[PDB]
């Protein structure tokens, strides 16, 4: 046991695994609002996550935005690249512009770089992470896309 | 400009001593060029005690105007222990001095740290300006 501390989902009481082998609930699969279906990977998954969008104690309140995954190299977190056009007024022309949003990728969905994801606003969960991934729309094996 | 007949006290600061500034005049360190009222003897470096007017030069530490000139100063603190005739043997942590004209006016408005009674009795302006006489 190399983990300094045990990890327990807060919603389920520890004396449920010990006995009552017959029934009860040992995992809390809360369903997110805004017409997004809690995935079965969360329903049957073994992950804990305090900041998981579905099982964990987090609420998706505020806006919901979509972006491509610039990076998946932190622990259960991704950076979503947002590509948009900003219109400069004097020149009747737009500028391609980019902003990077840090989001929490819960272990339920699987994300590889280059995939569309939906990120929903959450209570600040880190210095930079104020958004939690709700959905992943996987793209092909391999441009500027405004989502 | 010294007021009174001082009793002799042990002189701990010979020529070459770099005494610290005790005033806000702008000098940080003062080098002792020479001692006033000194008829020396052969080979004896001129030596000075607390309350004794000395001629000093200000080193590269000091403000530019103060530098490059022989200026009058009084030693207000000495590390060497000295015996007042009352029998007290007193010494201060550092050797420090105040830039003053021979008349008695001081270049800097403020004096820092304790100042010896010997300086303050001999020079009245020293007594008024200094926070503590010890």
């Amino acid at each position: 046991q190399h983990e300094r501390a045990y990890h327990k989902q807060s919603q389920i009481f520890q004396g449920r695994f010990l006995r009552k082998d017959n029934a009860r609930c040992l995992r809390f699969y809360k369903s997110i609002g805004m017409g997004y279906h809690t995935p079965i990977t969360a329903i049957n998954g073994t992950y804990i996550d305090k900041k998981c969008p579905f099982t964990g104690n987090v609420s998706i309140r505020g806006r919901i935005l979509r972006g491509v995954v610039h990076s998946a190299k932190m622990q259960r977190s991704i950076i979503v690249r947002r590509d948009y056009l900003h219109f400069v007024q004097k020149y009747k022309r737009y500028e391609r512009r980019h902003k990077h949003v840090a989001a929490h990728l819960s272990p339920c969905f699987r994300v590889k770089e280059g995939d569309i994801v939906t990120i929903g606003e959450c209570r600040p969960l880190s210095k930079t992470i104020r958004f939690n991934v709700i959905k992943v729309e996987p793209v092909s094996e391999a441009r500027f896309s405004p989502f | 400009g010294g007021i009174g007949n001082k009793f002799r006290i042990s002189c701990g600061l010979p020529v070459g001593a770099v005494i610290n500034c005790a005033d806000n005049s702008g000098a940080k360190s003062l080098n002792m060029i020479a001692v006033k009222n000194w008829k020396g003897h052969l080979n004896r470096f001129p030596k000075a005690s607390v309350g004794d007017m000395v001629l000093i030069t200000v080193g590269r530490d000091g403000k530019p105007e103060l530098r490059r000139k022989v200026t009058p100063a009084v030693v207000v603190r000495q590390r060497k222990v000295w015996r007042r005739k009352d029998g007290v043997w007193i010494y201060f942590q550092d050797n420090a001095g105040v830039i003053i004209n021979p008349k008695g006016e001081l270049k800097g408005s403020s004096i820092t740290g304790p100042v010896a009674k010997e300086a303050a009795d001999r020079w009245p302006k020293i007594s008024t300006t200094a926070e503590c006489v010890h």
Partner: protein
Amino acid sequence: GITHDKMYKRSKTGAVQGKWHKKRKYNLGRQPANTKLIVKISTIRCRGGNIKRRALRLSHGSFAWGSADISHKARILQVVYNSTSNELVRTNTLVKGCVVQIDSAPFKSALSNDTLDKEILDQIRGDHILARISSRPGQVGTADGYILEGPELLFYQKKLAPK
């Protein structure tokens, strides 16, 4: 002058931020009251004038056994496994999530009882029922906890194992 402002920190790019205002009282932090365990609850006036209780030294707490539904005050004998700092274990500081040995005497009667598991009934005889504190004594002024039950116990027994 302890503060929880983000102005003092760097930007996400590592760029030094510039300071626009002086320290504010609303953005204030307080010296941590590591709660020593004896082998006094201070009152502090917070924002809004609300008074939060800070336990500095607290002897016992309302520990509980949920599966057997028996919950009694018990004495905190000793602190084991802080999980953040080993220094806190040997100074017997009280934080939430702090495993602790409560005296088995209030729960001694249940030893006669049976069917409430078997491992937890063995602890009743020893005088050492393991229990994690559930309340932040610095903020809530109380050290009420819960006896470790089931796998959490097995993990915290393996951690505490004599090796």
